[PDB]
């Protein structure tokens with residue numbers, strides 16, 4: 001009985017990391033075997049290059065950094081398929097959708113070109129998109145020193161996320177991330193319990209193919 | 210008057226490196242501004258990962274290593290376009306075609322998926338493919354300790370190279386690399402002088418788009 005692959009995507013400060021942590025804690029307390037993953041995975045050789053880039057400690061050519069983000073997913077694919085086949089549900093904080101949206105927000109990058117490197121990745125059984133109005137995101141923090149920490153760029157990435165959501169091949173669910181941390185958690189956890197039960201019924205899919 | 214982008218591809222031991230070196234030497238002695246490039250470019254952070262992989266000092270997941278090879282090309286794109294626009298002809302020892310053929314030779318990799326990451330790269334004005342029968346390649350050396358150093362795998366990559374050569378968008382020229390080093394050089398140098406003259410007439414193209 002395979003585990004489900006559940007991805008959290010969403011606007012800045014909507015709570016992807018907070019909710020992915022709480023979801024894994026809650027699923028394990030309810031008897032599930034569940035583990036947390038995130039992308040970028042900064043612990044690998046490629047992950048260190050990406051971390052330096054995002055921190056602005058280094059500059060990387062836009063196409064090159066897009067492919068490194070994708071490669072950083074591919075290198076975890078053997079582990080992801082092993083865990084899922086062992087019945088472990090994986091809760092992932094960002095995935096290929098962030099990959100496509102963030103490069104897709106840059107000038108002269110088509111969504112098609114941006115998608116290709118990730119075609120074939122393990123297909124999420126559930127993609128949660130945490131929505132939050134900017135007035136509410138503004139009370140949760142201030143723009144940082146990191147790469148992409150600006151409103152004009154996050155808006156362009158948001159348009160790309162909406163283009164991706166038109167893809168009916170994927171089990172997208174919108175989450176109203178403006179509620180309390182607990183209320184949002186409950187919405188996500190109930191959606192996750194449903195997906196976990198149905199994932200044991202269909203083989204793990206392939207993304208965008 | 211832009212420089213030309215000339216790529217050398219070919220079967221193992223056909224003489225890509227020998228001929229790319231001699232071509233750059235000959236073009237500069239004939240008054241051209243010409244420089245040598247090669248892929249993988251092992252000097253960068255990504256290039257070091259690729260070098261370790263090819264030397265079998267490390268293992269890399271097949272998709273991940275394919276994207277790193279492509280990224281290693283992208284990171285040199287700003288330099289390539291700068292040199293070409295300055296009138297410098299660039300002679301390159303392997304390019305995206307090797308990228309697609311070598312991953313394409315592995316099981317479960319379509320030529321389509323393999324091509325995507327390199328779509329958009331600076332398009333070669335001339336792609337030379339050095340052909341050599343295996344009996345003749347056999348007298349030029351013995352299989353090494355490196356990755357891909359085996360006949361069954363080189364044969365699969367060779368089929369992929371022939372699929373790529375069906376692409377009429379590209380100025381492919383076959384070279385009979387079985388002749389002497391000097392005779393092959395002369396064949397390549399005359400083809401290169403012709404391409405250099407015509408490249409000053411059309412803008413640098415984009416590969417596979």
Ligand SMILES: Nc1ncnc2c1ncn2[C@@H]1O[C@H](COP(=O)(O)OP(=O)(O)O)[C@@H](O)[C@H]1O
Nearest residue numbers: 012013014015016017018140177179180181184
């Ligand atoms: N529903 C929520 N209500 C109020 N604050 C929240 C909520 N979700 C997250 N936060 C706070 O907002 C900040 C951003 O949360 P985080 O999970 O790191 O977001 P993301 O990973 O989407 O950037 C954190 O300080 C977190 O405590």
Ligand SMILES: Nc1ncnc2c1ncn2[C@@H]1O[C@H](COP(=O)(O)OP(=O)(O)O)[C@@H](O)[C@H]1O
Nearest residue numbers: 221222223224225226227349386388389390393
């Ligand atoms: N035309 C040729 N005739 C005879 N030996 C050659 C010829 N071209 C290359 N060689 C030798 O064969 C070997 C492989 O050449 P090299 O240029 O390194 O090939 P490649 O880069 O295609 O693997 C080298 O020792 C080189 O000196």
Ligand SMILES: Cc1cn([C@H]2C[C@H](O)[C@@H](COP(=O)(O)O)O2)c(=O)[nH]c1=O
Nearest residue numbers: 039040054069094095098099102147148
């Ligand atoms: C996974 C992923 C993240 N990103 C970005 C989004 C964030 O700006 C950044 C750090 O992620 P975080 O907000 O999850 O800490 O990485 C990409 O640009 N491409 C990718 O493939």
Ligand SMILES: Cc1cn([C@H]2C[C@H](O)[C@@H](COP(=O)(O)O)O2)c(=O)[nH]c1=O
Nearest residue numbers: 248249263278303304307308311356357
């Ligand atoms: C450029 C390139 C080379 N290769 C391989 C072909 C050779 O086996 C190897 C070393 O190159 P070399 O024979 O030019 O020294 O790298 C790939 O697998 N992918 C690539 O994108």
Ligand SMILES: [Mg+2]
Nearest residue numbers: 016017018093
């Ligand atoms: Mg986060």
Ligand SMILES: [Mg+2]
Nearest residue numbers: 112116321325
């Ligand atoms: Mg396509």
Ligand SMILES: [Mg+2]
Nearest residue numbers: 144146147149
């Ligand atoms: Mg951040």
Ligand SMILES: [Mg+2]
Nearest residue numbers: 225226227302
């Ligand atoms: Mg060589």
Ligand SMILES: [Mg+2]
Nearest residue numbers: 353355356358
């Ligand atoms: Mg070698």
